[PDB]
């Protein structure tokens, strides 16, 4: 979809559908009032009949009105006078998009300048949310359908704002477009089934990306290299499968050569059966999303490439497929990690932290200013924070604060959990330097504690996206693309953009 | 056992054991009375003592009686002066057989003409049930025992009937003998353990059968052929095992060249672990019977060959072994079926419908007049219809009705369940054309619905024999041979025999 | 909502909203075409723009059109030019009703004569389904909401038909209105929470209904009466609770004095905890619907009273509340039923068949021509037939067939399951005449088998509505009102109405 910004009057714009807001009690703001006046009162005449109560997202669609250049006018409810919260604003926009998707109009004009959004400026923050919702809402994954989604008529949307706000709306659209393009890439990789989307496939995706971008260099480390580097934990996860593991490095040099890089580490478990500690059958298909950490790193990188941010960004994708077999890791195996710390693998279904720990040690070589790991790590995080909020831990309160602030401004929120030293003992092993599980109490936190033992060389944060990375059921089952908005926001903030 | 029919007087017949019926209140029918008189009232005299109440299947065994040529007389209770139901009649016969098997007599004569069986003619229907119970009751599967069953003395049974009915009893014996010989083959294949009875073994069985019979042509399609035909669902089931899959085609051309064939499709999962969606351990051994669909097709074919029915019969055995491994199918995999329809494999333990759907597409080439699939498909069918009655679904009312009627006449009953369109949606997938599971509601029906999407080219029915194909425990644990009687009866009906 | 029928031309009717169908490819039937012409081609002109593809239930709403007397015109998609199935037709009607409910129009005119419905005549069967969907869709249960549903503007719908069809449409409306009114009563009783809706409450409801209807006499039997009649199974169920049981008799004498009555027996377990055989907590709230058998009998009676059918109808509501306590029935208890047959209560959560068996014996006194029990009886029925189809068993083929045919014509379908004698032994007890459970195989059937032992005196059928009586979750959670349509249709059939 093409998304552009103009400052012309709403009544003057030639379009298939003009969209304007209407409050409860048929209350029209200055923009809608001017459109009503151009229609010689036709809009307020229809509103007087009472079909539209004006609750947020309710709609009334009109056809050709004399005095207007729009072929259709869509009235959308904006609710009571009170400013809208983020969720209500995004639902309003999605309601609009749903109607437009079903029409045979080639373009539409949104004239929603009068709608106030709580704690967001009328031009940048408000439109960041609208644009991302509109563009991400175009997403289709019909690759495996014999009957394809018939393409939609809607090819273009124009946002109307005042002259003074136009540049800021354009900046919101630029940023939202990069984020939505990155999210589409994330969502495609998440939604791909695990018989196709395995570690070698992700390596090929990375190599393709490297060829397409001059400032990107890609290196792929195979199973032998992982083993030779001393990555005993990463190797142990992957060995059970016929699909070998891959550590994928994507190095974007957008900053000055001397600038310390930001490192994103993504968990790329392409399918998590649990291994010998096998999962139950119910809902196991959703473990194709266990590479959503790696997918979100791909999508964040793709947003960064689109924006050409002037930062050095090193992406490390720790990819393996966790399968039961006659050569799989067993509960009770002890391995030596790249750091030299030994790990007793008490449960082979706590495998993400194993590929991550070795990759955290690998990251030391880049001499980073921040290392953020993203992983669908714990069912415990869904118990703690549910579907709405990513769990966040780290070893630097300034980094943790920056990620929280980015998630608030991006409306892709996270929430800090503590890594108090008292939780560490839960990982104690009588045999090895640590075990890989902490028991049934504080599961999200003990997984963060385990990772923290490998992150002492740098400023580090860990994002547990087990609850935010996909929707489990209903019509909308599938990858969400989170946390691409938070991560991209954090990088925009570090770039000063 | 040799089973013959004669029309001589019971008192006159030289035999190790003469069997005659006695009612309650010591009441003797015409046949029994004649034997009593020949015995000089000896039988009445013993009855007066009251040891035999005459309830169905009760017995009293006499030794040499003056005036008879029989060495022993077995009296068997026939109940009150009303006709017996099928179950009571078959139990009476089994009771008699159990006594004879324990004796050292080389033959026996059954003189049970006076016993009425409800809704069964005195010559054909009555003796179809008797002869099949007698012959199937001889079944022994002692090949894995170090101590073999002491072979039995009983080598021959003669059924006495009146002259007028002799040919119809002979026709019942001909048909029952073919059915029982088919059932023995089915039972042996089901009872064989899965380390021996794998898809390659079944292929060798088919090849051996092909060499033994001129009107039979056998082709075996291996794993690469299955893959190269585009059978993505069948291939997915078999990949996880070290034993590769086989699609076995047995083509019997007994009809006219231009007569459309009847196609039988059998599920041949030689062991069902569930795969990655692994089953619980308890009772898993009974999943060696997950090839009883394919076994019943082999047994029906053996009966048809014995009878030389004048029909074209194509048998398709879809054989694979469902194992967990590092190369097995995962929940969430999406495959392209031979038909081009895509399937999301949400649960790798819903595997029978996957090998079946591709085999249903394969069956289109034969331009059949009926396609019947037989499969141990759903635990839900045991919840719905239990151990007694096979679940039946289809896309043609006439075919379904023919199979029901065959089951009633063969005393191997089925019962229809509806494939209403409302159940289809339970198979919807957001990614593929369908998923392979429908959830906890209507599981037998949604499996039928899944298969129906591959059967639209022809008249089709599906038989879920999960409850009727074997007995789980007790002294009689093992394959039953069902539904060989129903299927054979259906083909006798189509042949006009 | 008032529902009336007229034979005036669609373009001529003064109304807030005129509803007409449009096919795919903008194809207009005779009625829609005549409206288009009166609108001076306005409707064709809007359709040419392509916003409405015409798939069943899609909508496009127009405002005031020159040449018409309708204030609004709703175009509704009717699909390709083939007849619609029942489900598609009812979903089309619900789509229309949804739009109308959100408008501020006091009335609407449905001009849907053009639309063909498969296997149902243009006037009676087609409009039975439309009228019931429209009227049942008006249902609101907001008693426990602090914020009430806003009263809807829509008060009247007019159906247009040709003069020749008017009588038959009016008959359909009369019957659908009775059915919908009965369903609303059923749904209210089902949706009441169990702290309010207990057996004494249902007894009050029945007494109040008796006072309002001349031809209705109501008797209520309390716990002591149930005990004193020798109803040891019914008494055993209710004894654990602080709410005592009630057996409610509602006798409608609408037939000739010497006509044998139809008896409906409803399970009225107002809450089923399982008792000492306690249920799991998950979903237990839905056991407030365990009196939906009884609720559907009240609803059917309400429909019969509205229609004044000329039949004698005796309703027996077997009401109890199944609770654990220090005085509750135990697994292993043996009780003497009213019939004198003893029952070993192996599981106290098989309680509905216990209150039903004693009520089936009580029904003998009426010398009925048919006895139908309706009960939310088995989870196994949901496994067998899911949410779409009621399970049906019986001891009379004619009665079973009549109920099946009623279900088809009412679009409230049932499906027969067999009560073969082989399933009876599953109920054997070493101690009593029978146990109340048959094990994990054929649960729906063994429950019907249990009941059949109490129904030998008369023609009897059993409806297991465990899957059809309510919706478990989502926006539409709550009672369905089924099987009031099937039961009312059966009584219409017996009355000759
Ligand atoms: C063994 C445990 C300590 C850890 C275990 N974690 C895992 O299995 C992770 O690898 C899972 N990928 C976490 C998960 C499970 C379900 C939904 C979303 C995310 C878990 O159950 O949380
Ligand atoms: C995963 C489910 C949708 C289907 C699943 N079906 C199976 O596993 C079939 O392959 C089984 N072969 C069915 C079965 C299980 C136990 C006894 C007899 C038959 C079942 O549990 O019924
Ligand atoms: C103990 C078993 C033989 C019978 C048991 N039946 C019951 O508990 C019935 O009283 C329940 N009212 C049946 C039920 C359970 C869940 C949803 C709908 C209907 C059941 O589990 O089906
Ligand atoms: K994936
Ligand atoms: K076997
Ligand atoms: K209730
Ligand atoms: Mn895991
Ligand atoms: Mn299986
Ligand atoms: Mn219960
Ligand atoms: Zn994982
Ligand atoms: Zn199976
Ligand atoms: Zn109950």
UniProtKB/Swiss-Prot annotation, chains A, B, C:
Matching InterPro entries: Leucine_aapep/pepB, Macro_dom-like, Peptidase_M17_C, Peptidase_M17_leu_NH2_pept, Peptidase_M17_N
Binding site for Mn(2+) 2: 267, 272, 290, 351
EC category name: hydrolase
One Gene Ontology biological process: proteolysis
Main location: cytoplasm
Top-level lineage group: Bacteria
PANTHER family with a match to the protein in the record: CYTOSOL AMINOPEPTIDASE, LEUCINE AMINOPEPTIDASE-RELATED
Name of the protein: Cytosol aminopeptidase
Phylogenetic placement of the source organism: Bacteria, Pseudomonadati, Pseudomonadota, Gammaproteobacteria, Pseudomonadales
């Amino acid at each position: 979809m093409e998304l552009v910004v103009k400052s012309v009057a709403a009544a003057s714009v030639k379009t298939a559908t003009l969209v304007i807001p209407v409050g409860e009690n048929r209350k029209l703001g200055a923009v809608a009032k001017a459109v009503d006046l151009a229609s010689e009162g036709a809009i307020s005449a229809v509103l007087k009949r009472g079909d539209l109560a004006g609750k947020p997202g309710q709609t009334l669609l009109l056809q050709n009105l004399q005095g207007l250049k729009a072929e259709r006018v869509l009235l959308v409810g904006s609710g009571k006078d009170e400013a809208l919260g983020d969720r209500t604003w995004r639902k309003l926009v999605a309601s609009v998009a749903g109607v437009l998707k079903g029409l045979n109009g080639a373009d539409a004009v949104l004239a929603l300048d009068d709608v106030a959004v709580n704690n967001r400026d009328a031009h940048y923050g408000k439109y960041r949310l609208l644009a991302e919702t509109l563009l991400d809402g175009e997403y289709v994954f019909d690759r495996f359908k014999s009957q394809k989604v018939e393409p939609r008529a809607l090819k273009k949307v124009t946002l109307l704002a005042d002259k003074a706000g136009q540049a800021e709306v354009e900046r919101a659209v630029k940023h939202a477009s990069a984020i939505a393009t990155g999210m589409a890439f994330t969502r495609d990789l998440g939604n791909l089934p695990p018989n196709l989307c395995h570690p070698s496939f992700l390596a090929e995706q990375a190599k393709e990306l490297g060829k397409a971008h001059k400032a990107l260099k890609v290196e792929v480390l195979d199973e032998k290299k992982i083993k030779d580097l001393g990555m005993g934990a990463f190797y142990a996860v992957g060995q059970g499968s016929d699909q070998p593991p891959r550590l994928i490095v994507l190095n974007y040099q957008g900053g000055k050569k001397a600038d310390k890089p930001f490192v994103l580490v993504g968990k790329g478990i392409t399918f998590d059966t649990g291994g010998i500690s096998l999962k139950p059958g119910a809902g196991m298909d959703e473990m194709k999303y266990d590479m959503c950490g790696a997918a979100s790193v791909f999508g964040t990188l793709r947003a960064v490439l689109e924006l050409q941010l002037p930062v050095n960004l090193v992406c490390l994708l720790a990819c393996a497929e966790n399968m039961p077999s006659g050569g799989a890791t067993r509960p009770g195996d002890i391995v030596t990690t790249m750091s030299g710390q030994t790990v007793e693998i008490l449960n082979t279904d706590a495998e993400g932290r194993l590929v991550l720990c070795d990759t955290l040690t690998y990251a030391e070589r880049f001499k980073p200013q921040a290392v953020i790991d993203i992983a669908t790590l714990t069912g415990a995080c869904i118990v703690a924070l549910g579907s709405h909020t990513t769990g966040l831990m780290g070893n630097n309160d300034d980094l943790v604060g920056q990620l929280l602030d980015a998630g608030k401004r991006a409306d892709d929120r996270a929430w800090q959990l503590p890594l108090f030293d008292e939780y560490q003992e839960q990982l104690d092993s009588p045999f090895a330097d640590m075990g890989n599980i902490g028991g049934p109490k504080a599961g999200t936190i003990t997984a963060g504690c385990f990772l923290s033992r490998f992150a002492k060389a740098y400023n580090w944060a860990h994002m547990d996206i087990a609850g935010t990375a996909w929707i489990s059921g209903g019509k909308d089952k599938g990858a969400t693309g989170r946390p691409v908005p938070l991560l991209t926001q954090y990088l925009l903030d570090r770039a000063g953009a």
